[PDB]
Amino acid sequence: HTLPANEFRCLTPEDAAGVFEIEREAFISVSGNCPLNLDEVQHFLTLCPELSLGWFVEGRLVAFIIGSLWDEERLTQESLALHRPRGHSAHLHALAVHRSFRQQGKGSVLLWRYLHHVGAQPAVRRAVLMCEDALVPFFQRFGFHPAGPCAIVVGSLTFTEMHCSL
Numbered sequence: 001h002t003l004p005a006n007e008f009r010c011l012t013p014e015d016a017a018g019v020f021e022i023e024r025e026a027f028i029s030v031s032g033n034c035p036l037n038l039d040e041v042q043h044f045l046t047l048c049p050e051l052s053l054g055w056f057v058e059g060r061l062v063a064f065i066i067g068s069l070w071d072e073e074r075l076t077q078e079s080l081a082l083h084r085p086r087g088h089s090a091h092l093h094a095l096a097v098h099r100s101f102r103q104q105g106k107g108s109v110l111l112w113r114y115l116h117h118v119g120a121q122p123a124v125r126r127a128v129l130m131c132e133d134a135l136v137p138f139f140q141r142f143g144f145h146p147a148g149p150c151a152i153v154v155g156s157l158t159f160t161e162m163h164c165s166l
């Protein structure tokens with residue numbers, strides 16, 4: 001009968017478009033590319049929705065995390081578009097908060113809720129992600145430890161890989 005003020009839930013392929021709209025501003029308007037195009041978003045929300053989490057305010061997505069499982073110690077170029085069902089690492093492909101909702105703790109709240117959420121899952125023993133050097137201290141607040149230059153290439157952007165035990 002109404003739109004919940006605040007709601008945390010895993011995403012579905014139906015949310016793909018909203019997710020991509022946030023990326024267009026959060027990533028594309030910045031570097032000219034984004035972690036996941038519409039097909040890549042749908043792919044993981046189809047294969048491993050349980051590894052996604054979204055924040056909806058008044059029926060609109062304002063924050064999201066989209067992941068999949070990885071089965072190797074370090075992140076590789078191929079891991080970008082893969083889901084390894086046998087893996088034990090929750091690979092965070094993207095984390096973003098709508099432009100009109102940043103710097104209010106939502107991203108940190110979502111990330112903490114996400115770590116516990118995937119950490120509840122039997123297989124998930126570790127969480128991994130890559131980020132630009134400016135965000136390394138941010139993720140260290142969540143237990144992530146920098147693990148050297150990430151092997152992954154994306155345009156002229158370079159990233160630092162980070163691992164967090166769960």
Ligand SMILES: CC(C)(COP(=O)(O)OP(=O)(O)OC[C@H]1O[C@@H](n2cnc3c(N)ncnc32)[C@H](O)[C@@H]1OP(=O)(O)O)[C@@H](O)C(=O)NCCC(=O)NCCSCC(=O)NCCc1c[nH]c2ccccc12
Binds near residue numbers: 108
């Ligand atoms: C960072 C985030 C999620 C925090 O949200 P928030 O605003 O709600 O934050 P909080 O309120 O919870 O907390 C604030 C903290 O966020 C940190 N922060 C925010 N903006 C920052 C900046 N410009 N530089 C350094 N630290 C910053 C600060 O340290 C700040 O601390 P302070 O309270 O002390 O000020 C939010 O600002 C956001 O959605 N940004 C745009 C997308 C993005 O970069 N996602 C993450 C990439 S890291 C993971 C990831 O997605 N990797 C994919 C990598 C990737 C693959 N392909 C690509 C193609 C292009 C580009 C990137 C990729």
